[PDB]
Symmetry: C2
Subunit: 313 residues, 2 copies
């Protein structure tokens, strides 16, 4: 059967943080940051607003956009590396708060590739035929695990949440191809320091793997889908670093103007990155039914994901 996105929702906190905000406690500057990452500002959730709070907002919209009631949700999967707690999970909270049925709800960790993994995981259940609507969320409150003494990561991450309803869609539309991967050998280059509680990154190592995986993984899902660079209406990669993005956009070999770019206003929001970017293209009327979009991302693990899907309910 054809399984796709029949409902979409996104959300970014209200507090906007400009690049000029780090000059006070870091050797940075708008010029530097903009040049190095292509970021101009990011969104940060308040102290009393955790990952579940963002996840909740993103979910409510995708439920209305799918044109269904929360009672119709057959399962909840929240992709996040920053859940409020390991238990109860963010999905457990969405179950009660969304007023859904007492269906299965879990968070699956795959970092920045998490959303595609969950999106793909949901497809597997919907194909079993016993599941019609699965709520998939990609949410992260990275600001709470960001080291503000390490300018290369401090000025890089933001918070945000994205969400969709995976279920069967009209024929010809939906998920066409996808790819998931792991490489435990690169975990040391990007992890959460057990003691300190802060994220650790080796920019140069992470950078080199990022440009390659996102480039190649995308190429793979496109060929698997048997598509031509002509059939690609939008290339929506993990908004990790404008330079990483361009490099991968370049590797894939696709028009510079087909790439979704929202890293300038959100920064790197891990699992929310892709949905937060699809939200832009939708409300700027640049993504429409029957358009074919290419998804790709990677995160600390190292993990990666790539998807090919024709938009439409």
């Amino acid at each position: 059967m054809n399984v796709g996105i029949k409902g979409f929702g996104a959300y970014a906190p209200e507090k906007i943080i400009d690049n000029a905000y780090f000059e006070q406690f870091l050797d940075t500057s708008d010029e530097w940051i903009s040049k190095m990452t292509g970021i101009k500002e990011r969104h940060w959730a308040d102290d009393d607003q955790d990952t579940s709070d963002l996840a909740y907002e993103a979910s409510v919209k995708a439920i209305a956009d799918a044109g269904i009631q929360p009672e119709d949700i057959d399962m909840i999967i929240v992709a996040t590396a920053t859940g409020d707690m390991p238990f109860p999970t963010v999905a457990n909270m969405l179950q009660e708060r969304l007023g859904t049925g007492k269906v299965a709800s879990m968070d699956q960790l795959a970092a920045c590739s998490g959303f595609m993994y969950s999106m793909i995981t949901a497809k597997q259940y919907v194909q079993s035929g016993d599941y019609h609507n699965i709520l998939v969320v990609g949410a992260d409150k990275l600001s709470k695990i960001t080291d503000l003494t390490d300018r290369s990561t401090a000025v890089l991450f933001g918070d945000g949440a994205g969400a969709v309803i995976i279920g069967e869609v009209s024929e010809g539309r939906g998920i066409i191809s996808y790819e998931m991967g792991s490489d435990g050998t690169g975990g040391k280059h990007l992890y959460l320091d057990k003691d300190t509680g802060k994220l650790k990154m080796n920019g140069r190592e992470v950078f080199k793997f990022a440009v390659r995986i996102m480039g190649d993984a995308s190429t793979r899902v496109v060929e698997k889908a048997n598509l031509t660079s002509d059939d690609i209406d939008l290339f929506i990669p993990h908004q990790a670093n404008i330079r990483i993005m361009e490099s991968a956009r370049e590797r894939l070999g696709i028009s510079k103007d087909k790439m979704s770019v929202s890293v300038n206003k959100y920064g790197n929001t891990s699992a929310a990155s892709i949905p937060l970017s699809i939200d832009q293209e939708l409300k700027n009327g640049k993504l429409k039914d029957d358009d074919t979009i290419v998804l790709v991302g990677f995160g600390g693990g190292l993990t990666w994901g790539a998807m090919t899907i024709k938009w439409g309910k």
Copy 2:
């Protein structure tokens, strides 16, 4: 198709802690901890040994018992609430440490019910026809999140790991029926306190829920399977506490000598609970090919699950 367990393995740390150990800092006694929990002793991983390490040990056994090589694994799903770090995930670490391919690998959060969730997640992936040997793990080092000044839970939790390879089994064996559920209103009765980093539990509220949910869900999966307590060879519940286990067994109305009990030597090992108990029945000669068992558990969240599965490769 018939999807079941084609390889099994379990592990528990070398350090065994006697009930009398807690007398030096808690007002307890062997008789008291027994009377209340039925636990006699449990295992605690070493200071330099994390969930990863436990997961690893069971995985090696599970792959060897399956009769395959690490290069045959198509995916790696790790169920835990005490993973080393949110990223990389325990799964990512196994991918490497196991010398597996660069296959998909992620951790899934559903507390003590996660192991069942994950086995089902794998079922869905195998039913697609694209996956054949999915390494699923149940691991937890509850000891690092247990508050020893709270004898309530201090004497309850222990560490350990369980693992299985999910694939296609013969002679119409494997998973017959299942039920995964969730209920976020109980999140307050069992959560990881953010500030303190220690597990917080409301005993009575969890007890009440546990007994009811295990008994009821078991009855449903059996009935959904068109069976009776007679056809069930073993009733293997989350070894959360001997008193909670008997109450459920009484509700399910199954034979007292059909219930698998291992809490006595492991205590509560969360996700590892059921696989750790299956390991005991296998070697004591109580579980054999073509036997029909019933798995059921519950956890913080709250979550719960139940499976009816005919043993056999």
